[PDB]
């Protein structure tokens, strides 16, 4: 039993809280909630070890930015957000992870960069300019729906993964 202190971060709409609610709850927030700060729990079993998630849910509003240096300390491993029909959201991941990265005075933080909102019918990122990212971070990339639950599950088993190894 083990447990992972885990961050969803990214701009202001991405999906963030959806993502986390759909994870706990198999459930689909339609409405748009802004969060302040809130925190989730889940229980499961990943690779045969019982991991006991500890996920924050940030906020994407400017105002409470301050917030960010403490939970940057805190947090374990980050799930860097981005909506693939927002390019601004997909460029904020850069600010997201070097804020990360000096807060924490390293640059192996474990990381995933998450391309949500992947039910869409039209998009702006496209998936090789996400993983070309991804690949010059050297972190895994997953495409994602907080709707549907698409790659919902993998998202977050695999940042637990990028803990567990570094
Ligand atoms: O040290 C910290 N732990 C905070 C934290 C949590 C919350 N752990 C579970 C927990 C236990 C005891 C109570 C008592 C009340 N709540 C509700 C609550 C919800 C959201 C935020 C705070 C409290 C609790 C919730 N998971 C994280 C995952 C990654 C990084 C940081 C955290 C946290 C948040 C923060 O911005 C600064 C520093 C810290
Ligand atoms: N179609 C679709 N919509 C999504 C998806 N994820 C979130 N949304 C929608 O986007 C809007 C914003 O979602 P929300 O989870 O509140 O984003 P957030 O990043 O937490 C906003 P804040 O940073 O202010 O807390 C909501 O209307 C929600 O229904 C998704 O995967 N697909
Ligand atoms: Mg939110």
Known sequence: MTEYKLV??????VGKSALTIQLI???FVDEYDPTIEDSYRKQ???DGETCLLDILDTAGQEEYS???????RTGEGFLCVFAINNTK???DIHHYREQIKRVKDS???????VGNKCDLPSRTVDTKQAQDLARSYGIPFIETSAKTRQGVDDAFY?????????
């Open 8 to 13: 969803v971060v990214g701009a202001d709409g």
């Open 25 to 27: 709850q198999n459930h």
């Open 44 to 46: 499961v079993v990943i």
């Open 66 to 72: 301050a917030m960010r240096d403490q939970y940057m």
């Open 89 to 91: 959201s997909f460029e």
């Open 107 to 113: 640059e192996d933080v474990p990381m995933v960069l």
């Open 158 to 166: 695999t940042l637990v993964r990028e803990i567990r190894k570094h």
